[PDB]
Design a binder for this molecule. Structure first.
Ligand code: ZN
Ligand code: ZN
Ligand code: ZN
Ligand code: ZN
Lengths: 478, 478
C-alpha cells in the first residue's frame, strides 16, 4: 500500500488538506492523520497538491503510416505520460477501409498489451456496411468500447461522408455510444492541397493554407447538426479555431450536448511555426488541424473559461525527422502528428493556473474529470474518493522544468515547445496505487497497465430519451 | 410616351417630389413641372409614391414536374406580377441530369417568349462534367447569364455534392458569375423523409418534420464556407430559419460577400399551417424550405432591418389541388411550391412599412434595388434616373386589397394568405414605359417582355481580386 501524507487534495470543485491511503489499486481511506497499515510506503506530500491523474483521451501510439509507424509505441508512450502526470489514455483502433473492425481491434489490443498504465480504445468508423454496424454492437457489448471516431477529412482514404455519418450516429444512438469526430471538410482540404501543389507551394508553410480555419468550422457545424437531427451527443476532437468553437457554443446555447477537446499546442502556438527557414523544424509542427493565427488561441482560452471547451488531450502521434522528411518535396506527404502526452498537464498548469486564467479546480476538470464524465468513467477515474482507481499526481507548484527533445521521455526527436520553461510540475505520479514517477525517476514497466472498459449509456442518454419521448410526432386526424 | 405627374418619387435612399417622363422604354426626364411632349399620356400621381417596379429574382413559371407542369405559365405569371407591382423576374433553367445546359436554355427561352414583362434566367448546375463547365462559359459569354443555381437537397436527383459545389463555384469565379444555392442538407432530408414514412406519418404535417431548421442552417454554413474558401460571392435563396440567417450574419461580420433572399411567406406564416384538418389546405402550404415555428419569422424581420437579409422574392411555383393531391398518400410526392408573385410587394409594404419595421427606402431596396445590384442590373433596373428602364409602380398608401384565390390573377386555386387584407397597394404598374396595370385593369400582352441579359463580373469581384492578391501564398525561402 501507499499513503500520501501532508498534501492538499485538489479536486474539480474543492481543496482540502487530507491524507490519502491506496491499496489493491484503489483509494482506501481519505482523512486527516490516517493510520498507517503495516509495511506501507509513505510519500511526503507537504507543500504540494494531490490531484487525480491526468486522462488523455486522444493518443495514437505506434499508429501505422505508409510502411512506417509512429516512433512512440504503447509502452514508451504510456511511460512518458506517467512522467508528465497522465495516468491513463484512450487511443484509437483505426480499421483500414473494408477491414473488419473486430480484426483491427484485436490487433491493437495485441499492440497495447505492453502499456505501462491503464488504457482504452475508441474505434474509428472508416467505412460502412451492415457488417460494420453489427461489429460496433459487439465492440460495445463485449469489448468495453463506448465511443466511435469519425474522420471528415482524408478524402479517398478514411473519410466518412454524410451518409456514413448518418448511419453511424444512428447506430451510436441505438448502442448508447458517444460519436466523436475529427472535424475538417475533406473535399476542401483535398482541393486546396492540389491547388497549392500546382502553384509550387510544396513546403510545410503550405500545410496550414491547405486547411484554413473555416474548413474546421464547416465540418463542426455539419457534425453538430447531424447529431442534433439524429438525437445523439457529440464529442469534437482537437478544436483549434474560433469558427469551430463558435459552432459548439451555438449548439450548447440551443440545449444540445456537444463537447469540445483542445490540445496545449493549439492554446499556445500560432501558425508562424510553419514559416521557419529550417525545413525539418517547420515540418515538426505539421499536424491536422494545424496551428492557427493568434486570435484563435485567445478564443480557445475563452472557451475553456466559459465552459464551451471541456477536455484537454494531446493527439500524441510521434514521427521523427526521417519520417517527417517523407514529405520533403510534398507537404501533403509529411506524416501528420506532434508529441504531447508528457507535457500536457505542466503546459496547462503553467499557462492556465499561474496566469489566473483557470482555477486549480478547472485544471483538474480539464485534465481528468470532464473526460471521465463524458466517456462514462466517472467516478472510477478523475475522482479522489474511497473506492476510486488509485490514479493520482502529486504536484509541486514551485518546481520547474524545461521542455526539450534532448531530455523528454517521449520517443521522438522533436518537441513543439522546445526550450519552454514551466513552473509547476508533477513531482510524483501514482497509477493503480503504485509509485511509477518519482523525483526524476520513471519506474514504468511493460505490461503493467490494464485494458479499461467503458460502459455504454452515459447520463446524457437519459435526458435525450425524455426529449425524444416529448418530440414524438403525431398525425393529424382528417 | 408617359408622364407621371405630381407623385412623390421614392428610391432606395431618398424621397422627393418630381414628375417623371418615360419614352422609348426609358426614363427620359425627372423634375418638377416637366413639359408635356405632344401626344404624351399623363398619369395623375397626386397623393401617391412612385418607385422602381419590383424585381422578383426567384420564379418557376410552368416548371415541369412528373407528368405535369406548374399551373402558372410565363405569360400568366408575369401578368400577375404586373398587377402586383412587380415588373421583372429572374426564373431558372433546370436541366435534367446529363442534359446539355444549352439545350435546356433554348427550351426555356421558347417557354418564356410569352412573358408580358422583362425576364431573365439563372441556370441550375444539376450535374457536372467538363462539358457542363464549357457550357457555363458559353452561357455567360453569349446568352447573358451571370448566375448559377445549386441545389444542396434532392438526393438521388439533382443534388450538388461538395465536389460539384467546389468545381462549379471555381468555374463561377473564373467567369465572374454569382453562385446561388438552395441550402438544405439533402442527406438529412432524405433520411428523415424515409424514417417518417416508415412510421406511417404520410400527411402534410410530416413535411416540416422531414426538414427542420438546422438542416437549412447546416447547408448554409457549408455553402458559405465553400464560397469563403474559393473566394466567390454567394447568394442564398429563400432563407427561412434563424440558424441559416445567423450563418449569413457570421460570415458578413468577417467581411464576406454573402447575400440572403427571403419570401413573404417565411416572414409571416408559421408551421401550424401544416396541421390544418383539411388535407388540401395543409398541402397548399407545402414548399421547401417549409414554414417555420414563429421564432423564425421574428429573426428574419430583424435580418431585414439589420442588413443581413438583402432581397425579397416569391419562389413562385404554382400547383393546383389536383396536382398537390399527387401526394395524398405520401407527403414526399406532393409537388412543392406556393404562389406569391402578385402579392409580394403589398404584403411587405403592409407588414413592414405600415408597422414602422421598414422605411420606405428599405422597402425599395428590398423589392428591386438590392437584387439589381447583386446581379449586375443596377442602374438599368431598380433605379429612378434618366436613362434607366421605365419599370415603375405607383403606390397608393391608403388603398386596400383582400388577397383571395377567388380574385387574384395568379393561375392557381390556392393563396397562402387567403383572406388577408393589406393597406397600401400598387394602383398602376409601368413596364418598358407602358401602363400595363391601372386601377384594376390588367393590360398585359403575351410576348411584350424582353429577355434581360446580365453582364458578368459585378463590382464585388473587383474587391475580391485585390483581396486575393493581398492574401497570396508566399513560399518560404530556405
Ligand atoms: Zn484528428
Ligand atoms: Zn488524432
Ligand atoms: Zn428552391
Ligand atoms: Zn426555387
Amino acid at each position: 500500500s501507499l499513503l500520501i501524507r501532508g498534501a492538499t487534495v485538489v479536486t474539480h470543485e474543492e481543496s482540502y488538506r487530507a491524507d490519502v491511503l491506496c491499496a489493491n489499486g484503489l483509494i482506501q481511506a481519505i482523512g486527516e492523520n490516517l493510520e498507517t497499515p503495516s509495511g506501507c510506503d509513505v510519500l511526503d506530500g507537504g507543500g504540494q497538491y494531490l490531484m487525480p491523474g491526468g486522462i488523455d483521451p486522444h493518443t495514437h501510439m505506434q499508429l501505422p503510416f505508409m510502411g512506417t509507424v509512429a516512433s512512440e509505441d504503447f509502452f514508451s508512450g504510456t511511460a512518458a505520460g506517467l512522467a508528465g502526470g497522465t495516468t491513463s489514455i484512450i487511443d484509437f483502433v483505426i480499421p483500414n477501409p473494408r477491414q473488419s473492425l473486430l480484426e483491427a481491434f484485436h490487433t491493437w489490443r495485441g499492440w497495447a498489451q505492453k502499456s505501462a498504465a491503464d488504457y482504452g480504445f475508441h474505434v474509428a468508423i472508416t467505412w460502412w456496411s451492415d457488417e460494420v454496424a453489427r461489429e460496433m454492437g459487439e465492440l460495445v457489448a463485449q469489448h468495453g468500447v463506448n465511443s466511435f471516431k469519425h474522420f471528415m477529412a482524408y478524402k479517398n482514404a478514411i473519410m466518412a461522408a454524410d451518409d456514413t455519418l448518418v448511419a453511424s450516429f444512428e447506430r451510436c444512438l441505438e448502442l448508447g455510444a458517444v460519436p466523436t469526430v475529427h472535424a475538417e471538410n475533406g473535399e476542401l482540404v483535398f482541393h486546396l492541397q492540389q491547388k497549392l501543389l500546382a502553384q509550387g507551394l510544396t513546403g510545410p508553410e503550405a500545410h496550414p493554407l491547405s486547411r484554413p480555419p473555416q474548413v474546421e468550422g464547416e465540418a463542426a457545424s455539419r457534425a453538430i447538426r447531424i447529431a442534433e437531427t439524429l438525437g445523439t451527443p457529440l464529442y469534437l476532437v482537437h478544436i483549434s479555431s474560433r469558427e469551430a468553437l463558435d459552432e459548439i457554443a451555438y449548439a450548447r446555447a440551443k440545449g444540445q450536448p456537444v463537447y469540445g477537446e483542445v490540445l496545449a499546442g493549439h492554446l499556445l502556438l500560432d501558425d508562424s511555426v510553419y514559416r521557419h527557414p529550417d525545413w525539418a523544424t517547420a515540418a515538426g509542427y505539421v499536424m491536422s488541424p494545424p496551428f492557427r493565427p493568434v486570435e484563435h488561441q485567445e478564443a480557445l482560452w475563452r472557451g475553456l473559461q466559459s465552459g464551451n471547451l471541456h477536455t484537454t488531450a494531446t493527439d500524441h502521434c510521434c514521427f521523427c525527422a526521417e519520417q517527417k522528411a517523407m514529405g520533403r518535396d510534398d507537404f501533403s506527404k509529411i506524416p501528420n502528428g506532434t508529441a504531447g502526452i508528457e507535457d500536457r498537464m505542466a503546459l496547462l498548469w503553467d499557462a492556465g493556473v499561474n496566469s489566473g486564467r483557470l482555477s486549480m479546480h478547472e485544471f483538474v476538470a480539464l485534465t481528468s474529470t470532464n473526460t471521465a464524465k463524458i466517456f462514462n468513467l466517472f467516478p472510477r477515474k478523475g475522482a479522489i474518493r474511497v473506492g476510486a482507481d488509485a490514479d493520482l499526481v502529486l504536484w509541486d507548484p514551485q518546481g520547474s522544468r524545461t521542455l526539450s527533445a534532448a531530455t523528454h521521455h517521449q520517443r521522438v526527436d522533436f518537441n513543439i515547445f522546445e526550450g519552454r520553461t514551466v513552473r509547476g510540475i508533477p513531482s510524483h505520479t501514482i497509477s493503480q496505487g503504485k509509485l511509477l514517477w518519482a523525483a526524476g525517476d520513471l519506474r514504468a514497466e511493460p505490461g503493467a497497465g490494464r485494458y479499461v472498459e467503458r460502459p455504454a449509456y452515459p447520463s446524457v442518454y437519459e435526458v435525450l430519451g425524455r426529449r425524444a419521448e416529448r418530440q414524438r410526432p403525431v398525425a393529424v386526424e382528417r
